[PDB]
Amino acid sequence: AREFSLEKTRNIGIIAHIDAGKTTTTERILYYTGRSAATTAAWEGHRVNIIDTPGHVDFTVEVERSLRVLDGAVTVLDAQSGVEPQTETVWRQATTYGVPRIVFVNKMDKLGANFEYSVSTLHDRLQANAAPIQLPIGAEDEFEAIIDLVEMKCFKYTNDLGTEIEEIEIPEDHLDRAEEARASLIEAVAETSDELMEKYLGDEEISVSELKEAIRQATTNVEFYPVLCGTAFKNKGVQLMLDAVIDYLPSPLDVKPIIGHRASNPEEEVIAKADDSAEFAALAFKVMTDPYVGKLTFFRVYSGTMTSGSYVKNSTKGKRERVGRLLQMHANSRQEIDTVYSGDIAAAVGLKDTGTGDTLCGEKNDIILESPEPVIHLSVEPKSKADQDKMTQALVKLQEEDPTFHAHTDQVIIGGMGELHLDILVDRMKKEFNVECNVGAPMVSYRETFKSSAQVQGKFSQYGDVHIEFTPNETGAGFEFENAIVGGVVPREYIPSVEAGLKDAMENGVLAGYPLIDVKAKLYDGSYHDVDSSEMAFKIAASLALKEAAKKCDPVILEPMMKVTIEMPEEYMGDIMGDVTSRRGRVDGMEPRGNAQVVNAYVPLSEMFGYATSLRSNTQGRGTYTMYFDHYAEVPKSIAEDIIKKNK
Template sequence: MAREFSLKNTRNIGIMAHIDAGKTTTTERILFYTGRTHKIGEVHEGAATMDWMEQEQERGITITSAATTAAWKGHRINIIDTPGHVDFTVEVERSLRVLDGAVGVFSAKEGVEPQSETVWRQADRYGVPRIAYVNKMDIIGADFLNVVESMRDRLQANAVAIQLPIGAENDFVGIIDLVEQKAHIFKDDLGQNIEVTDIPAEYLEQVEERRLELIEKVAELDEDLTMKYLEGEEITVDEIKAALRKGVCEVKIFPVIVGSSYRNKGVQLMMDAVVDYLPSPLDVPAIQGHLDDGTEAVRHSSDEEPFSALAFKIMTDPYVGKLTFFRVYSGILESGSYVVNATKNKRERIGRILQMHANSRQEISIVYAGDIAAAVGLKDTSTGDTLCDEKHPVILESMNFPDPVIEIAVEPKTKADQDKLGVALGKLTEEDPTLRAHTDEETGQTILAGMGELHLDIIIDRMRREFKVETNVGKPQVAYRETFKAPARVEGKFVRQSGGRGQYGHVWVEFEPLEPGTGSQFESKVVGGSVPREYIAPALAGIEEQMKNGVLAGFPLVDVKATIVDGSYHDVDSNEMAFKIAGSMALKAAKDKCKPVLLEPIMKVEVTVPEEYMGDVMGMLNSRRGRIEGMDSRGGAQIIRAKVPLSEMFGYSTTLRSGTQGRGVFSMELSHYEEVPKSIAEEIVSKNKGGE
């Protein structure tokens, strides 16, 4: 089977935005216009094709990024719909990792919202080329140019309008293309009858001003065009498009287009912009990786290169079982062939290969470089693993996932649920790297840790629906940490002589605090063989294991360096276990000398409220130990930015809603960890005296 679409005509794009900016509706319209669905699904009717889990349809938000494929004007477009809720940032993160370009969707009324900023910054980190689509031009308060300004202002993005709306709100009837200088007037509700005409006279002045700005921005991207511009020569449409495409691919400029997906206006022009400006796999830098021996390797987008792919999502499908979504970076893959999971050094057989269309699928026998598909039958592969040709192993750079900030205890309601709980959690943690599950050794409860209350709510809900597991859920708990404030040298000595062979392990360890966020480090500076080499690793392992349980209140100890500097051993009685225990005893002994403190997650909170509630909301934040960091006004509403401890944010949404008659909204994401005030720390320690 030969390639249907060339690499040059392939686009791998994500659609990213703030919750409710209209992402899923936009994707629905794309699928409708590219002939993939015959009836448009509405999100608020709960029938959108991309939102295929039951909960997504109920809540009207997108949780898992479904990958789907569509064709437009001779191009294949693989689309990944990403969730806009901050608890699901991991989904956005992993989508961005495997995309070549993205469409950022903004609401014409709200403009740049907190989650838009988060997602935009993630895309900046991965260097993803983007175009921006200002949606909802038909709603009251829509203001296109205001959004372009807020992108420049809040995102520091070099945004430039390449379209202008004709009318706004109910009078939004068409779009002016600034590049080609034509007006597109919509003649029907489905947006399929479009008349291309000259620009209406009343818009000529505005068009001239905005087109001049566009040409100035384009000229900055290309030296030849700069000369042409300075010499007053006409820059052609093709030159503008070529320069914009180059600027977008180099992440130097972000063209902004406009529409109303719900009203079927502007989506086809957006598809044209995707084809015109977003990169194909050939336009983005070749992916970097490394070989077994640590040397760097590059895999170019080509069918001729050895096969390499990145698994970016695992899903459990009710019909075929475990589905592994992967992006092929180089080479080709046929169903039934063998590959190596280079990350885990395991051989895997590719059973069937499926091309996904939201929740229906088509079986294919071969995938080519640049494609996104799902494989059935991979046993050992998890998110972020590299799959590659057996003869040419390579490990592609993986993804980094944030640590969870919130925990809940779950207990199965019946004995039957107990057995199913383990299976359910096994599958769910495999699908979602930010979900962690462990058993509390003292209480025997299963503890789930995740990115936020909504994240964990949905996991509990999925356990009930998909795995039929009924659970009782405890109150959310904050994932505190511990660290040391002072360095110290301490001794850990474990001696047991009780007839016959004894136990003997003895180490001196230096502990020192590290910069926040560094993680923990372990090393040995033992000289002269006072501790034999084979006992150093067990002693360090003992320290590391004890760190997981902390020294104050049973929370993990972080950002500490442990160095074994000295010790002693016994020819007969010493063994690995004795040194492991000595290591953990040293850490416990450090409690009295290293000034341990509790750390708590501090959230970056943004509250948007009408002006009359400003005082009340600021008071509410202050009473929750919040620090107000700044205020902005946007579209008649006030935005308050603050840093607030997560422990104080439980139940905040209810308080905010009742305090602002339902008109206040807030978003939060993890900012950093910092020391808990002494009085509160003492209370937490006495409540959790599990670390003894």
């Protein structure tokens, strides 16, 4: 059957800033657990799956995803700096998905290392409930040992290899501060469940299992975050925190099961519990490719079971898949396996059509567990047709691992979330696939829509005729086409062509050439010739109606409005807001963080070029910012004409 019980499995990932020593902590974790998208491992009789989190936290989808693939997380902080801005955003993202966490204050041996101040930022910055289960005797060069408070055993470090560790009775001059630490811990834990709190005040002593299982409960409910310390590089406290992973972090059973919906019925509520007996459901979080095994699909099975050679349906794409070789990547090796039980993770070899973010389930069922318009695009220009073939190839591959962009072939136009998102896809193509090309200008993706509503008539003479009503739709509701035809004034044969006509005509727009969006269309009238009428004729007709509606509907150009967030020492708080308004944004709100303030704004993306330099300059590097797409907004009438002219 199965090697590890559902109770014995730990799916984890690492939340960290990039100076927090994230890669080293992961490195070390892999060592001790091993006798990369996802790594299979073992610690103290327990299965451990370490899922790799995204490179930069601006990566929302990529991080949103992994956050779903794991259960609990380990947050790594730099001892000097405690919680960084980047730590907070993912710490927030994690809370929204209800992910239990434990904190590893790393680099205790570093100049400026402060365990007390670190722990502080968890409180002050996140208003989060966290208390140390350990204490770092010594700091900076002096970091020596660690006191385990849930036990009250003290472990000492002789070397930097994480060996020859000495278990000792707590050095006594460290007591007055040790029981305090243990005490506050009990309290800080008490505020979650009621029972314990009363147990504590009763001057009653608490043993291990009751305290541990308590912390296990509080942290599993995401109501408390256990705090640990060490330096991963010298291997101080790494093994201890691994033990901690096994104690206080959740199994697949100990976390709220993922929500899903049926394909047939879009809006349903399907809970996927973790059950070996129940129906099969899986999500593909990563697509690798190896020169040998081919296309590897990384997926996490939430429910049921899967065996190689069996049959699954990809519900997202609605197609049929047949599971071949099944691999599990360990640190120094990889293992063929015939079964992946609920809660486990593996890679699927040669899975024909599945990308990142699809869903796999029994070919009898419909479930789907994951339900993003490009705001910016580039023009790409190869240096040959030979160089081209290396492209349409590269792209098909690039859409499998990156669902989040949009590639139009028809000089081929990439589009995506942000410049960075595009630069990466430029990166890999030039080097990874060896495509020698010309990258054009990064350009905002403008849209067009209708202000006024109107009734107009397309007509063409081969003959076609149409009367259409256009009304602006609820922004975001997209395009609707209703057919009101009255009894054959327009023959049914041509009615779908009228629709295909609008689309074509709408994609090319009216004003600047940008696609028209969020518009309702009702075909209520027309006329035809039994002979001359044709599909083409009614397509041109609908196209001409649009050109007309464009005259009476007061069309406007829309541009992406980004939600900008800025964190800087307050010194500059005035000189940033002079910036924003010049960029035609507006400050939507503000919050304190220490001597820095978090500023929330809405800025047009067309005006966000070069904001990186400016923020760094004005704050002299102390600055940080994230920005997202929020909504589309009406462009100022003067600017619209500039674009209208400039397009000729």
